[PDB]
Design a protein around this motif. Structure first.
Motif, PDB file in Angstrom:
ATOM      1  N   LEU A  30       0.842  -1.221   0.000  1.00 31.99           N
ATOM      2  CA  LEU A  30       0.000   0.000   0.000  1.00 31.99           C
ATOM      3  C   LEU A  30       0.870   1.262   0.000  1.00 31.99           C
ATOM      4  CD1 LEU A  30      -2.821  -1.085   2.586  1.00 31.99           C
ATOM      5  CD2 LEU A  30      -2.531  -1.660   0.126  1.00 31.99           C
ATOM      6  N   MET A  31       1.903   1.228   0.858  1.00 35.27           N
ATOM      7  CA  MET A  31       2.873   2.313   1.039  1.00 35.27           C
ATOM      8  C   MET A  31       3.714   2.533  -0.239  1.00 35.27           C
ATOM      9  SD  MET A  31       3.880   2.052   5.099  1.00 35.27           S
ATOM     10  CE  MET A  31       3.627   3.815   5.316  1.00 35.27           C
ATOM     11  N   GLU A  43       7.908   6.338   4.359  1.00 38.71           N
ATOM     12  CA  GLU A  43       8.638   6.259   5.648  1.00 38.71           C
ATOM     13  C   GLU A  43       8.230   7.407   6.602  1.00 38.71           C
ATOM     14  OE1 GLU A  43      12.574   7.238   3.297  1.00 38.71           O
ATOM     15  OE2 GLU A  43      13.077   7.675   5.376  1.00 38.71           O
ATOM     16  N   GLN A  44       7.690   8.494   6.019  1.00 41.01           N
ATOM     17  CA  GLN A  44       7.238   9.685   6.769  1.00 41.01           C
ATOM     18  C   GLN A  44       5.703   9.700   6.926  1.00 41.01           C
ATOM     19  OE1 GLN A  44      10.832  12.701   5.188  1.00 41.01           O
ATOM     20  NE2 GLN A  44       8.851  12.879   4.178  1.00 41.01           N
ATOM     21  N   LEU A  45       5.038   8.569   6.616  1.00 45.27           N
ATOM     22  CA  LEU A  45       3.557   8.433   6.668  1.00 45.27           C
ATOM     23  C   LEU A  45       3.120   7.200   7.477  1.00 45.27           C
ATOM     24  CD1 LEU A  45       2.093  10.767   5.272  1.00 45.27           C
ATOM     25  CD2 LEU A  45       4.151  10.194   3.893  1.00 45.27           C
ATOM     26  N   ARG A  46       1.820   7.208   7.833  1.00 47.58           N
ATOM     27  CA  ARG A  46       1.098   6.100   8.483  1.00 47.58           C
ATOM     28  C   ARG A  46      -0.182   5.863   7.670  1.00 47.58           C
ATOM     29  NH1 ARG A  46       1.656   7.341  14.998  1.00 47.58           N
ATOM     30  NH2 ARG A  46       3.268   8.950  14.938  1.00 47.58           N
ATOM     31  N   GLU A  55       0.465  -0.866  10.378  1.00 45.81           N
ATOM     32  CA  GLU A  55       1.923  -1.058  10.300  1.00 45.81           C
ATOM     33  C   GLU A  55       2.308  -1.806   9.005  1.00 45.81           C
ATOM     34  OE1 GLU A  55       2.905   1.189  12.465  1.00 45.81           O
ATOM     35  OE2 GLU A  55       4.208  -0.029  13.714  1.00 45.81           O
ATOM     36  N   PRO A  56       3.457  -1.413   8.328  1.00 53.06           N
ATOM     37  CA  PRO A  56       3.881  -1.990   7.016  1.00 53.06           C
ATOM     38  C   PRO A  56       4.084  -3.522   7.072  1.00 53.06           C
ATOM     39  CG  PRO A  56       5.680  -0.694   8.005  1.00 53.06           C
ATOM     40  CD  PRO A  56       4.427  -0.379   8.794  1.00 53.06           C
ATOM     41  N   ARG A  57       4.562  -3.998   8.235  1.00 57.46           N
ATOM     42  CA  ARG A  57       4.920  -5.411   8.478  1.00 57.46           C
ATOM     43  C   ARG A  57       3.694  -6.358   8.474  1.00 57.46           C
ATOM     44  NH1 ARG A  57       5.677  -2.482  13.551  1.00 57.46           N
ATOM     45  NH2 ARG A  57       4.145  -3.135  15.114  1.00 57.46           N
ATOM     46  N   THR A  58       2.485  -5.784   8.605  1.00 60.13           N
ATOM     47  CA  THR A  58       1.233  -6.554   8.736  1.00 60.13           C
ATOM     48  C   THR A  58       0.516  -6.706   7.373  1.00 60.13           C
ATOM     49  OG1 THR A  58       1.082  -5.507  10.938  1.00 60.13           O
ATOM     50  CG2 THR A  58      -0.879  -6.740  10.211  1.00 60.13           C
ATOM     51  N   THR A  59      -0.352  -7.732   7.250  1.00 57.50           N
ATOM     52  CA  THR A  59      -1.076  -8.048   6.004  1.00 57.50           C
ATOM     53  C   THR A  59      -2.415  -7.258   5.926  1.00 57.50           C
ATOM     54  OG1 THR A  59      -0.212 -10.317   6.406  1.00 57.50           O
ATOM     55  CG2 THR A  59      -1.638 -10.071   4.492  1.00 57.50           C
ATOM     56  N   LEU A  60      -2.997  -7.213   4.716  1.00 57.90           N
ATOM     57  CA  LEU A  60      -4.265  -6.523   4.408  1.00 57.90           C
ATOM     58  C   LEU A  60      -5.468  -7.264   5.012  1.00 57.90           C
ATOM     59  CD1 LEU A  60      -2.394  -4.860   2.529  1.00 57.90           C
ATOM     60  CD2 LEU A  60      -4.080  -5.152   0.670  1.00 57.90           C
ATOM     61  N   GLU A  61      -5.451  -8.603   4.882  1.00 65.15           N
ATOM     62  CA  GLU A  61      -6.492  -9.503   5.436  1.00 65.15           C
ATOM     63  C   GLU A  61      -6.646  -9.344   6.974  1.00 65.15           C
ATOM     64  OE1 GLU A  61      -3.478 -13.130   4.525  1.00 65.15           O
ATOM     65  OE2 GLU A  61      -5.118 -13.810   5.807  1.00 65.15           O
ATOM     66  N   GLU A  62      -5.551  -8.920   7.630  1.00 66.46           N
ATOM     67  CA  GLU A  62      -5.503  -8.694   9.083  1.00 66.46           C
ATOM     68  C   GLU A  62      -6.285  -7.431   9.481  1.00 66.46           C
ATOM     69  OE1 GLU A  62      -3.464 -11.331  11.122  1.00 66.46           O
ATOM     70  OE2 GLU A  62      -4.427 -11.922   9.248  1.00 66.46           O
ATOM     71  N   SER A  77       6.153  11.616  11.823  1.00 70.32           N
ATOM     72  CA  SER A  77       7.221  12.618  11.958  1.00 70.32           C
ATOM     73  C   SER A  77       8.293  12.155  12.970  1.00 70.32           C
ATOM     74  CB  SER A  77       6.608  13.977  12.361  1.00 70.32           C
ATOM     75  OG  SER A  77       5.602  14.382  11.443  1.00 70.32           O
ATOM     76  N   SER A  78       9.136  11.221  12.506  1.00 70.89           N
ATOM     77  CA  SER A  78      10.267  10.676  13.257  1.00 70.89           C
ATOM     78  C   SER A  78      11.140   9.866  12.286  1.00 70.89           C
ATOM     79  CB  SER A  78       9.779   9.797  14.446  1.00 70.89           C
ATOM     80  OG  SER A  78       8.901   8.763  14.019  1.00 70.89           O
ATOM     81  N   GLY A  79      12.297  10.432  11.901  1.00 70.35           N
ATOM     82  CA  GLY A  79      13.227   9.769  10.990  1.00 70.35           C
ATOM     83  C   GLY A  79      13.987   8.640  11.672  1.00 70.35           C
TER      84      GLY A  79
END
Length: 82
Positions: A30-31, A43-46, A55-62, A77-79
């Protein structure tokens, strides 16, 4: 099943994107898509499904990322560092 599904991603830019992805895919996908659509570095978005943080590490079905939904981009906003 549907195979894939057509969702929308409202950005921090105030525009709403429209991409198709599979439920077996991760939020990393998605990202990736919103990056090549509006241009903004993920990397600067949610990603935010229907008022839930994704979270990027998680699946869509979840998260039940089904067709016709609107994900929002709230700023992360945290590099990681230089």
């Amino acid at each position: 099943g549907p195979g894939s599904l057509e969702i929308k991603i409202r950005t921090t830019e105030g525009r709403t994107l429209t991409v198709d992805v599979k439920p077996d895919r991760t939020i990393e996908e998605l990202m990736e898509k919103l990056k090549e659509q509006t241009g903004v570095p993920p990397e600067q978005l949610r990603v935010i499904y229907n008022g839930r943080e994704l979270e990027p590490r998680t699946t869509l079905e979840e998260y039940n990322i089904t067709p016709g939904v609107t994900l929002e981009l709230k700023t992360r906003s945290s590099g990681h560092g230089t």
